[PDB]
Scaffold this motif. Structure first.
Motif, mmCIF file in Angstrom:
data_model
loop_
_atom_site.group_PDB
_atom_site.id
_atom_site.type_symbol
_atom_site.label_atom_id
_atom_site.label_comp_id
_atom_site.label_asym_id
_atom_site.label_seq_id
_atom_site.Cartn_x
_atom_site.Cartn_y
_atom_site.Cartn_z
ATOM 1 N N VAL A 213 0.840 -1.208 0.000
ATOM 2 C CA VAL A 213 0.000 0.000 0.000
ATOM 3 C C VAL A 213 0.876 1.259 0.000
ATOM 4 N N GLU A 214 1.881 1.313 0.901
ATOM 5 C CA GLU A 214 2.750 2.479 1.013
ATOM 6 C C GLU A 214 3.592 2.647 -0.252
ATOM 7 N N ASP A 215 4.169 1.544 -0.761
ATOM 8 C CA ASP A 215 5.013 1.565 -1.955
ATOM 9 C C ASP A 215 4.209 2.077 -3.149
ATOM 10 N N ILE A 216 3.022 1.483 -3.393
ATOM 11 C CA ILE A 216 2.201 1.917 -4.540
ATOM 12 C C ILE A 216 1.808 3.397 -4.430
ATOM 13 N N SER A 217 1.408 3.810 -3.211
ATOM 14 C CA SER A 217 0.970 5.168 -2.941
ATOM 15 C C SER A 217 2.050 6.197 -3.127
ATOM 16 N N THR A 218 3.336 5.763 -3.068
ATOM 17 C CA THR A 218 4.488 6.617 -3.216
ATOM 18 C C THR A 218 5.159 6.449 -4.585
ATOM 19 N N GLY A 219 4.476 5.750 -5.500
ATOM 20 C CA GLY A 219 4.897 5.646 -6.891
ATOM 21 C C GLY A 219 5.665 4.422 -7.347
ATOM 22 N N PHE A 220 5.936 3.469 -6.437
ATOM 23 C CA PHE A 220 6.653 2.242 -6.786
ATOM 24 C C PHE A 220 5.799 1.433 -7.724
ATOM 25 N N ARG A 221 6.436 0.816 -8.723
ATOM 26 C CA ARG A 221 5.743 -0.090 -9.625
ATOM 27 C C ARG A 221 6.613 -1.312 -9.856
ATOM 28 N N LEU A 222 5.986 -2.442 -10.200
ATOM 29 C CA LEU A 222 6.706 -3.665 -10.520
ATOM 30 C C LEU A 222 7.701 -3.436 -11.648
ATOM 31 N N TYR A 223 8.883 -4.065 -11.537
ATOM 32 C CA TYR A 223 9.956 -3.958 -12.527
ATOM 33 C C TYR A 223 9.558 -4.678 -13.839
ATOM 34 N N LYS A 224 10.261 -4.376 -14.937
ATOM 35 C CA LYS A 224 9.983 -5.001 -16.213
ATOM 36 C C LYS A 224 10.495 -6.438 -16.247
ATOM 37 N N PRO A 225 9.631 -7.430 -16.550
ATOM 38 C CA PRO A 225 10.133 -8.808 -16.687
ATOM 39 C C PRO A 225 11.033 -8.904 -17.919
ATOM 40 N N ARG A 226 12.040 -9.776 -17.869
ATOM 41 C CA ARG A 226 13.005 -9.937 -18.950
ATOM 42 C C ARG A 226 12.315 -10.203 -20.305
ATOM 43 N N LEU A 227 11.226 -10.984 -20.291
ATOM 44 C CA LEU A 227 10.549 -11.364 -21.531
ATOM 45 C C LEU A 227 9.596 -10.325 -22.071
ATOM 46 N N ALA A 228 9.327 -9.255 -21.306
ATOM 47 C CA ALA A 228 8.429 -8.188 -21.751
ATOM 48 C C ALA A 228 9.212 -7.137 -22.524
ATOM 49 N N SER A 229 8.735 -6.789 -23.734
ATOM 50 C CA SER A 229 9.366 -5.700 -24.491
ATOM 51 C C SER A 229 9.097 -4.364 -23.772
ATOM 52 N N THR A 230 9.788 -3.294 -24.181
ATOM 53 C CA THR A 230 9.501 -2.001 -23.589
ATOM 54 C C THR A 230 8.061 -1.559 -23.903
ATOM 55 N N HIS A 231 7.508 -1.914 -25.076
ATOM 56 C CA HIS A 231 6.121 -1.549 -25.423
ATOM 57 C C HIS A 231 5.130 -2.306 -24.524
ATOM 58 N N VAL A 232 5.394 -3.596 -24.256
ATOM 59 C CA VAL A 232 4.498 -4.342 -23.361
ATOM 60 C C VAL A 232 4.544 -3.733 -21.960
ATOM 61 N N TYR A 233 5.734 -3.374 -21.490
ATOM 62 C CA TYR A 233 5.890 -2.782 -20.165
ATOM 63 C C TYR A 233 5.219 -1.408 -20.101
ATOM 64 N N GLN A 234 5.223 -0.649 -21.207
ATOM 65 C CA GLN A 234 4.530 0.638 -21.225
ATOM 66 C C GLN A 234 3.031 0.380 -20.967
ATOM 67 N N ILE A 235 2.455 -0.638 -21.625
ATOM 68 C CA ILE A 235 1.025 -0.949 -21.437
ATOM 69 C C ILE A 235 0.760 -1.360 -19.975
ATOM 70 N N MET A 236 1.643 -2.195 -19.371
ATOM 71 C CA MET A 236 1.489 -2.560 -17.964
ATOM 72 C C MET A 236 1.406 -1.309 -17.104
ATOM 73 N N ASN A 237 2.317 -0.339 -17.359
ATOM 74 C CA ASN A 237 2.351 0.885 -16.582
ATOM 75 C C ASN A 237 1.102 1.735 -16.780
ATOM 76 N N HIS A 238 0.490 1.672 -17.967
ATOM 77 C CA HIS A 238 -0.757 2.411 -18.174
ATOM 78 C C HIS A 238 -1.861 1.844 -17.297
ATOM 79 N N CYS A 239 -1.855 0.493 -17.087
ATOM 80 C CA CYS A 239 -2.844 -0.143 -16.221
ATOM 81 C C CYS A 239 -2.661 0.295 -14.778
ATOM 82 N N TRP A 240 -1.437 0.696 -14.398
ATOM 83 C CA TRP A 240 -1.100 1.067 -13.030
ATOM 84 C C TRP A 240 -1.055 2.547 -12.801
ATOM 85 N N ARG A 241 -1.801 3.311 -13.608
ATOM 86 C CA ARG A 241 -1.901 4.736 -13.334
ATOM 87 C C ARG A 241 -2.756 4.969 -12.100
ATOM 88 N N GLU A 242 -2.333 5.903 -11.261
ATOM 89 C CA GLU A 242 -3.031 6.128 -10.010
ATOM 90 C C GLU A 242 -4.501 6.491 -10.159
#
Ligand SMILES: *CCC(=O)N1CCC[C@@H](n2nc(-c3cccc(C(=O)Nc4ccc(C(C)C)cc4)c3)c3c(N)ncnc32)C1
Length: 263
Positions: A213-242
């Motif tokens: 809860v504290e980490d997410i609230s302060t902007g922490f997000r899960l790291y990029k998995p090795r198999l995810a391209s930068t475009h896939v990781y961009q989409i993951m981050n869009h899902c995690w917009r506050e």
């Protein structure tokens, strides 16, 4: 929607749940099925029985179907479409190193298609995660357990502060206020994408629920998995917009992910 006990046969166990055992069995004149027996007190049985016919109409090839309810005697049974290869979490973990990013993206696309159907039907999943995505024929992934937390009676699972609450898949408005929406399901879908591309790693494995809860609230997000391209990781981050309003709808994610998969 009512199934009589004589219409079911139990063959062998599939596995356990927090609230009941799941069996492989047969359903008379129909098919092989998965049968869940639910312990007394775990579910608001009357609420579920009221909603069964409604849930059964949410028929989509990417959703695990509810076939009916056997309620003649306690424990009551719920009868579902049998998914031959089981939970996606274990399917990925036991086969690390096998799947190409195109296959992992295809798994995310199957889930996204089922979620886009629920979003259009105004149905909120509430607990989307790899553990309730199931693997079927031709490696299809289907979403299960949409809306089921509405019937759970154990407050440790349903209260945003409960010890069993799925905080790791929850958007901030869900962990703070239980403010469910299709946009909170989008946040959970981003975590699911991370579980898929990481080949079944556990998100925030060394963090307690309070620390997430504290980490997410302060902007922490899960790291990029090795198999995810930068475009896939961009989409993951869009899902995690506050803000839920800034997250894409499933109808938008389905086009964006399909564009990558079909390119
Ligand atoms: C990871 C191992 C694995 O493959 N698992 C875990 C053990 C059970 C396996 N399994 N479950 C289902 C299935 C599908 C849809 C719905 C349910 C279910 O019981 N839902 C439910 C949720 C919550 C409540 C509470 C009390 C309100 C009640 C019921 C279970 C499987 C199917 N359909 N096929 C194969 N294996 C399945 C998955």
């Amino acid at each position: 929607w009512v199934i009589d006990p004589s219409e079911l046969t139990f063959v062998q166990e599939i596995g356990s749940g927090q609230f009941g055992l799941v069996h492989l069995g047969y359903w008379l004149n129909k098919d092989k099925v998965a049968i869940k027996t639910i312990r007394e007190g775990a579910m608001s049985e009357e609420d579920f029985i009221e909603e069964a016919e409604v849930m059964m109409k949410l028929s989509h090839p990417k959703l695990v179907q509810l076939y009916g309810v056997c309620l003649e005697q306690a424990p009551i049974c719920l009868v579902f479409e049998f998914m031959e290869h089981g939970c996606l979490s274990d399917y990925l973990r036991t086969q690390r190193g096998l799947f190409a990013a195109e296959t992992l993206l295809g798994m995310c696309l199957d889930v996204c298609e089922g979620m886009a159907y629920l979003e259009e039907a105004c149905v909120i999943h509430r607990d989307l995660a790899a553990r309730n995505c199931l693997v079927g024929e031709n490696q299809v992934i289907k979403v299960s357990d949409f809306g089921m937390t509405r019937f759970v009676l154990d407050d440790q699972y349903t209260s945003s502060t409960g010890t069993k609450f799925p905080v790791k898949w929850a958007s901030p408005e869900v962990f703070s206020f239980s403010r469910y929406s299709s946009k909170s399901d989008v946040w959970s879908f981003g975590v699911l994408m991370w579980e898929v591309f990481s080949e079944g790693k556990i998100p925030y494995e060394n963090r307690s629920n309070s620390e997430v809860v504290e980490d997410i609230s302060t902007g922490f997000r899960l790291y990029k998995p090795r198999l995810a391209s930068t475009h896939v990781y961009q989409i993951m981050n869009h899902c995690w917009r506050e803000r839920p309003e800034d997250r894409p709808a499933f109808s938008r994610l389905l086009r964006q992910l399909a564009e990558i998969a079909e390119s």
